[PDB]
Ligand binder design. Structure first.
Ligand SMILES: Nc1nc2c(ncn2[C@H]2C[C@H](O)[C@@H](COP(=O)(O)OP(=O)(O)OP(=O)(O)O)O2)c(=O)[nH]1
Length: 176
């Protein structure tokens, strides 16, 4: 199971997955089909339970007002989450990140790994997560996407609510 965990989800609005298809979006010379509809109403406790029951499929917006993000995220889409998570956690602690949480997503094997950085300017967070992704791809075949990213439209920087906690690490360091 899992109760309520602090990704510091923005609850002012949410995104609902719709059947289809998806609405065409052109972005940076490329085509996207958007299968999620923004809902301009609060993400309530009621709605999350419905999501956990799989009666609905809701996503929260990674990008906060003033283009800040609270988390950078690895979206792992492979079938070896334990191997992925092991190499990711070694990389993270080493690059200074000791606070992160991996959650199970809808497809067995898949995860979202949130790195609990704190409010970060959007561009900087895009860059930092890309750089980590590159470092990680040296030691593992790339079967993840990273968030936030400018590779897709701003509204595709959303994450389906997590279903279960896969793993979690916490810590603090002090030198000199
Ligand atoms: N706005 C928008 N966001 C999307 C769309 N497709 C995916 N996303 C966002 C929400 C998803 O949680 C996130 C990662 O996409 P994935 O296809 O890996 O889905 P997800 O991780 O939720 O499930 P899974 O890997 O299948 O366990 O990307 C879309 O068509 N429109």
């Amino acid at each position: 199971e899992m109760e309520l965990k602090l990704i510091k989800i923005d609850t002012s609005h949410y995104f609902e997955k719709k059947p289809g298809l998806g609405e065409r979006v052109d972005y940076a010379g490329r085509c996207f089909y958007n299968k999620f509809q923004r809902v301009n109403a609060m993400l309530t406790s009621s709605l999350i339970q419905k999501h956990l029951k799989r009666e609905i499929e809701i996503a929260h917006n990674l990008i906060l007002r003033n283009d800040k993000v609270e988390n950078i995220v690895f979206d792992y889409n492979g079938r070896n989450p334990e191997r992925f998570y092991h190499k990711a956690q070694l990389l993270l602690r080493e690059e200074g990140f000791m606070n992160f949480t991996a959650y199970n997503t809808k497809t067995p094997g898949h995860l979202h790994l949130y790195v609990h950085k704190g409010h970060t300017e959007l561009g900087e967070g895009e860059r930092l997560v890309k750089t980590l992704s590159m470092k990680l791809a040296q030691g593992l075949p790339k079967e993840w996407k990273v968030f936030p990213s400018n590779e897709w439209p701003k509204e595709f920087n959303i994450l389906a609510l997590p279903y279960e906690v896969f793993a979690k690490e916490r810590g603090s360091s002090w030198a000199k």
